[PDB]
Enzyme design. Structure first.
Site, PDB file in Angstrom:
ATOM      1  N   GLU A  78       6.152   4.749  11.372  1.00  0.00           N
ATOM      2  CA  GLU A  78       4.712   4.898  11.238  1.00  0.00           C
ATOM      3  C   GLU A  78       3.985   3.835  12.028  1.00  0.00           C
ATOM      4  O   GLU A  78       2.806   3.963  12.333  1.00  0.00           O
ATOM      5  CB  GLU A  78       4.379   4.761   9.759  1.00  0.00           C
ATOM      6  CG  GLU A  78       2.929   4.684   9.387  1.00  0.00           C
ATOM      7  CD  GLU A  78       2.785   4.290   7.933  1.00  0.00           C
ATOM      8  OE1 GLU A  78       3.303   3.208   7.576  1.00  0.00           O
ATOM      9  OE2 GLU A  78       2.172   5.055   7.154  1.00  0.00           O
TER      10      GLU A  78
ATOM     11  N   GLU B  57       0.850  -1.189   0.000  1.00  0.00           N
ATOM     12  CA  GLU B  57       0.000   0.000   0.000  1.00  0.00           C
ATOM     13  C   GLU B  57       0.887   1.240   0.000  1.00  0.00           C
ATOM     14  O   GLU B  57       0.567   2.251  -0.631  1.00  0.00           O
ATOM     15  CB  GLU B  57      -0.882   0.034   1.251  1.00  0.00           C
ATOM     16  CG  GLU B  57      -1.955   1.131   1.224  1.00  0.00           C
ATOM     17  CD  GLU B  57      -2.519   1.488   2.602  1.00  0.00           C
ATOM     18  OE1 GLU B  57      -3.417   0.768   3.084  1.00  0.00           O
ATOM     19  OE2 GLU B  57      -2.057   2.483   3.208  1.00  0.00           O
ATOM     20  N   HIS B  58       2.011   1.134   0.711  1.00  0.00           N
ATOM     21  CA  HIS B  58       2.988   2.218   0.853  1.00  0.00           C
ATOM     22  C   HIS B  58       3.941   2.502  -0.309  1.00  0.00           C
ATOM     23  O   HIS B  58       4.791   3.391  -0.206  1.00  0.00           O
ATOM     24  CB  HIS B  58       3.826   2.028   2.127  1.00  0.00           C
ATOM     25  CG  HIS B  58       3.222   2.651   3.346  1.00  0.00           C
ATOM     26  ND1 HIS B  58       2.210   3.588   3.278  1.00  0.00           N
ATOM     27  CD2 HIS B  58       3.553   2.552   4.655  1.00  0.00           C
ATOM     28  CE1 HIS B  58       1.944   4.039   4.491  1.00  0.00           C
ATOM     29  NE2 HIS B  58       2.747   3.426   5.343  1.00  0.00           N
TER      30      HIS B  58
END
Ligand code: HEM
Ligand code: HEM
Ligand SMILES: CCCCC[C@H]1C(=O)O[C@@H](C)[C@H](NC(=O)c2cccc(NC=O)c2O)C(=O)O[C@H](C)[C@@H]1OC(=O)CC(C)C
Lengths: 100, 59, 379, 442
Positions: free
Chosen positions: D134, D57-58
């Site tokens: 994160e 996703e990143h």
């Protein structure tokens, strides 16, 4: 002829409080002095001790102990509280004497 | 499948559960006694008054 | 509070001593003894209250009455059996309960402990009476010594006794006035027991390791409630077994012969749960000494808290004093045997001996082996 | 009203000889939003494969080979479209929102990601330490950790139990490859859905997808979507104490049915009845939701929320609250009690409101374009097709008291729940206790 050193080692494994995996000091009954002592403990060692006690309790409560491996070895037992406790005591003995 | 049938029907509703303890106890009683009484008496054949009551009531 | 289990003055107490009570997670059976002790207090009070429904406190009727209460009253026999034995299950549990407490330094909860003693004492006291009640050869002669036992106390003694019991010799009065004490006393035990637990709760229950347990502590209810109900049935089975299979197993038969003020039975063996101190008493030839010894024989428990030196509470990590301990428990089981034994050289000496180790093991050995073990740790 | 529902534009759907299913809803709206919703997740990850879906996703945005970073973004920014997305445990998506005047442009973009991601080995080694940071942030969001831990123990041992984020050790060692090993493995048309809402004309969409999704399935495999390994629910607890925290969180739940199950309705209505509280509200007078009321009167919690988080074949029907170190208990008690009440003596007058409350979220669940696409994106993927508000309506416009009772009890009464609690929870009683809190002393 017979080393107090040699002896202590005995008693230590004899007391077998290390089979539960907790340092000597993790046992000393908690009296006024000790409490103040422990209350002076750096948060590091505190949480350490806690868990060690809770683990100890959890074991004990299961009737089972810690694998021969995890026992703590005499020479590696960390007198984490003796130092604080001592100041305490003398702090007191100092006060007790002054109040006379 | 007994245990499942049991739970669902008997042990689930705290209302029911109890109800079977009762009706059950009644059954356990009646049965436990007769059984006990028998076990006992049998281990004492011809010694009890129930057993000699007859030499003035035959056997 | 939507709780209720906590918003009701009465109801709280319960959901605060049986539910929600914080108890150490790790707790051996030696912790049931007490909840059991209760059940005894009950079984005793219930049965005895019920047995009193048929007793007739009066020399000429006293003995028989009981017999009647057995032979005549439905299950009256069962009641008695149960009672006399509860007496024991009672002393057993108490004797164990004291054990446990001794070897986990629960005696550090002082008050909860001191009260405890009182209970013992009283339980010993109440059990003394009551046994007089059936007025058997024993009943009588026990009445006569135990009482007369206060002869020793000078000045106020001879007098205190000729008052202790009725007039000037154990006779009817003493009996009626004993029944009364017996009927009454148990209810005192009950009260004090409340006071006992109160003091306890002030300080959580101990725990076998002898180190803080706040780290764990489980809700009394879910757990220990069951655990008690279990221990209930466990040390209930023996007591019942006795009462239904060999009732008088512990009960001296000599007491089955109605009292005779004129002849004390050759072979007067006091009740088992009393023998130890009994021995101590006779092995110290001197009225006063005899008594004194005895006095402290039990009245020593009060000092155990002061005869504690270990830097650690319990002694599970004190293998030294640990065996000294059993040396004691056995030194006790001994005194007992030596108590149920007539006075001759084979014994006697053994007697006064153990009846010496007893004290020392307590007054001296323990505290010594105590500090010693601390030094074997640099303390 | 009911007429308002009915006059609501049907949703168009048609799959490719490829596998993708292309659906969407049309309105007047200049704007819109469109996205590809993959049947991909963490659940689909392994012991050493856990994380990828994320680490992915990143990088799903940092470019493709056709058009590297600086350009994609520049092409996206420059046209004013918003390309956002996520990745759960059994659901991942990537939606954009432009002016509908970009359907064909957005669509292409979409395809160019789900299929060709730069995965610049140099871009990765950065996003690596980015996540690891994160993640260290996701961590003090006790509001969440409390849920993963819930999963962790609720579904212990199985695939769900693994957190969408994945262990630090994997994110510290995922290989340029493993990512691709993830992409090529799960990112396939049969499991992907092209959905959109706004001013778009289905056909134009189709053709563009049908145009930029030039996928071709040879084998029978490629055309088949694997069904997942069943996850064992495990009534248990997991306590991560720390009196050092402002307060403790508690989350307990029973196994959920799974999207399919028709009861998820009545059940959804259930959660409507106790709802949620949160000190800012304005109601010690609140609607039935006593949990709410009582939460006020006796200042029980900072906030509590009911949830029926469900998945393909399993679920997590429970409740989560935040409270001072001190009122944790009274809360559970009062709360857990409600479940009981709920499925032992719930009334019509109650369900009446419940419903309408759902029918309000039911509608507002579809508020705008992005959200609508979500459902479409979802609907198909997990349900099979699209559930019209006209449908959901009946579904839950027909749930009576006796039905809620029959349901909740069926999934709550005397069931072994899973509790999770981080923070100063010394006050939360053991399990057995919160366990025997499952049956009402009727
Ligand atoms: C604290 C627990 C109690 C103890 C330690 C206890 C002990 C005894 C003992 C050992 C006896 C003599 C039993 C025998 O002959 O073997 C006795 C008798 C008796 N007790 Fe208790 N008792 C207790 C409580 C009660 C209570 C609460 C009552 C009623 C208030 C009661 C009423 C009697 C009666 C009726 C007798 C006479 C009949 C008999 O000897 O069995 N007892 N009790
Ligand atoms: C009157 C009868 C008695 C009852 C019913 C009673 C009851 C209790 C109970 C239930 C406890 C809770 C923990 C446990 O079960 O061990 C307790 C604790 C204690 N009792 Fe008793 N007790 C009695 C007599 C005594 C006696 C005679 C002693 C005196 C030595 C004593 C000493 C203690 C001690 C030291 C504790 C606290 C430490 C611990 O629980 O670990 N109790 N007692
Ligand atoms: C209306 C009823 C109120 C309940 C009263 C009743 C109440 O304290 O019940 C328990 C807690 C009490 N023991 C314990 O709590 C207890 C404490 C630590 C560990 C264990 N278990 C070991 O594993 C315990 O069992 C037990 O010793 O009974 C007492 C003492 C009292 O009851 C007695 O006054 C009755 C006498 C006075 C007649």
């Amino acid at each position: 002829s017979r080393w107090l050193e040699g002896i202590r080692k005995w008693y230590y494994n004899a007391a077998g409080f290390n089979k539960y995996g907790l340092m000597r000091d993790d046992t000393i009954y908690e009296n006024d002095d000790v409490k103040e002592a422990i209350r002076r403990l750096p948060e590091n060692l505190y949480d350490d001790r806690m868990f060690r006690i809770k683990r100890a309790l959890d074991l004990n409560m299961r009737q089972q102990i810690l694998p021969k491996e995890q026992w703590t070895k005499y020479e590696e037992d960390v007198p984490y509280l003796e130092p604080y406790l001592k100041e305490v005591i003398r702090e007191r003995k100092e006060r007790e004497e002054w109040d006379k | 499948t007994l245990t499942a049938r049991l739970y669902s029907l008997l042990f689930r509703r705290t209302s029911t559960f109890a109800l079977t303890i009762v009706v059950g106890a009644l059954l356990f009683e009646r049965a436990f006694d007769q059984g006990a009484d028998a076990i006992y008496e049998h281990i004492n054949e011809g010694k009890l008054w129930k057993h000699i009551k007859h030499k003035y009531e035959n056997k | 509070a939507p709780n209720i289990r906590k918003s009701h003055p009465l109801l709280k107490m319960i959901n605060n001593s049986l539910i929600d009570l914080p108890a150490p997670s790790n707790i051996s059976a030696w912790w049931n003894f007490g909840s059991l002790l209760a059940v005894c207090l009950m079984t005793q009070i219930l049965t005895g209250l019920l047995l009193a429904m048929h007793y007739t406190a009066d020399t000429s009727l006293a003995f028989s009455s009981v017999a009647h209460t057995c032979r005549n009253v439905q299950y009256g026999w069962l009641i008695r059996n149960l009672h006399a034995n509860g007496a024991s299950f009672f002393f057993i549990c108490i004797f164990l309960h004291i054990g446990r407490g001794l070897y986990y330094g629960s005696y550090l909860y002082k008050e909860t402990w001191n009260t405890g003693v009182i209970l013992l004492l009283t339980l010993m006291a109440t059990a003394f009476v009551g046994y007089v009640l059936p007025w058997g050869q024993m009943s009588f002669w026990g009445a006569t010594v135990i009482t007369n036992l206060f002869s020793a106390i000078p000045y106020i003694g001879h007098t205190l006794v000729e008052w202790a019991w009725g007039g000037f010799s154990v006779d009817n009065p003493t009996l009626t006035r004993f029944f009364a004490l017996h009927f009454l006393l148990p209810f005192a035990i009950a009260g004090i027991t409340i006071i006992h637990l109160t003091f306890l709760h002030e300080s959580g229950s101990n725990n076998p390791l002898g180190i803080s347990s706040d780290s764990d502590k489980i809700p009394f209810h879910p757990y220990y409630s069951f655990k008690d109900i279990l221990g209930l049935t466990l040390m209930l089975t023996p007591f019942l077994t006795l009462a239904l299979f060999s009732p008088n197993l512990l009960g001296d038969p000599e007491n089955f012969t109605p009292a005779n003020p004129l002849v004390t039975p050759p072979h007067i063996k006091p009740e088992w749960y009393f023998l130890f101190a009994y021995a101590i008493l006779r092995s110290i030839p001197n009225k006063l000494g005899g008594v004194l010894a005895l006095a402290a024989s039990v009245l020593i428990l009060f000092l155990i808290p002061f005869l504690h030196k270990s830097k650690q509470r319990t002694m599970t990590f004190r293998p030294l004093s640990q065996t000294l301990f059993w040396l004691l428990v056995a030194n006790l089981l001994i005194l007992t045997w030596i108590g149920s034994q007539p006075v001759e050289h084979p014994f006697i000496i053994i007697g006064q001996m153990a009846s010496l180790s007893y004290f020392t093991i307590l007054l001296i050995l323990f505290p010594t082996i105590g500090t010693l073990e601390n030094k074997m740790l640099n303390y | 009203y009911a007429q308002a529902l009915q006059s609501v534009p049907e949703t168009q759907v048609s799959q490719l000889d490829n596998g993708v299913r292309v659906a969407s809803e049309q309105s007047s709206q200049p704007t819109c939003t469109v996205g590809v919703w993959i049947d991909a997740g963490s659940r689909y990850e392994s012991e050493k494969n856990n994380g990828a879906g994320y680490f992915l996703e990143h990088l799903a945005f940092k470019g493709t080979k056709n058009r590297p970073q600086n350009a994609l973004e520049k092409e996206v920014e420059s046209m004013g479209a918003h390309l956002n997305a996520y990745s759960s445990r059994e659901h991942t998506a990537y939606y954009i929102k432009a002016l509908s005047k970009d359907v064909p442009k957005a669509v292409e973009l979409l395809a160019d990601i789900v299929q060709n991601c730069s995965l610049e080995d140099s871009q990765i080694e950065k996003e690596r330490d980015v996540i690891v940071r994160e993640l260290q942030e996701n961590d003090t969001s006790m509001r969440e950790v409390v849920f993963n831990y819930l999963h962790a123990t609720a579904f212990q041992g199985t695939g769900l139990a693994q957190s969408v984020e994945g262990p630090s050790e994997n994110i510290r060692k995922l290989s340029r490859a493993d990512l691709t090993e993830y992409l090529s493995t799960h990112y396939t048309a049969p499991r992907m859905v092209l959905a959109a809402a706004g001013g778009v004309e289905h056909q134009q969409l189709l053709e563009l997808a049908q145009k930029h999704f030039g996928g071709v399935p040879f084998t029978y495999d490629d055309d088949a979507v694997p069904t997942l390994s069943k996850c064992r629910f495990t009534g248990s607890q997991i306590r991560h104490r720390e009196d050092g925290l402002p307060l403790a969180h508690v989350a307990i739940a029973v196994e959920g049915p799974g999207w399919a199950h028709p009861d998820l309705v009545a059940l959804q209505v259930a959660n409507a009845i106790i709802g949620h509280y949160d000190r800012t509200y304005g109601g010690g007078l609140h609607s039935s939701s006593p949990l709410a009321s009582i939460a006020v009167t006796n200042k029980l919690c900072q906030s509590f929320q009911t949830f029926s988080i469900c998945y393909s074949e399993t679920g997590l029907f429970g409740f989560y609250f935040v409270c001072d170190r001190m009122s944790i208990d009274d809360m559970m008690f009062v709360l857990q009690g409600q479940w009981m009440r709920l499925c032992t003596s719930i009334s019509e007058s109650e369900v009446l409101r419940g419903k309408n409350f759902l029918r309000n979220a039911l509608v507002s669940h579809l508020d705008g374009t992005t959200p609508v696409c979500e459902d479409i994106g979802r609907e198909l993927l997990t349900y099979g097709r699209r559930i019209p508000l006209e449908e959901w309506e009946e579904r839950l416009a027909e749930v009576d008291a006796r039905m809620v009772r029959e349901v909740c009890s069926k999934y709550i009464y005397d069931q072994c729940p899973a509790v999770a609690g981080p923070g100063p929870i010394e006050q939360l009683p053991d399990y057995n206790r919160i366990r025997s809190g499952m049956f009402w002393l009727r």
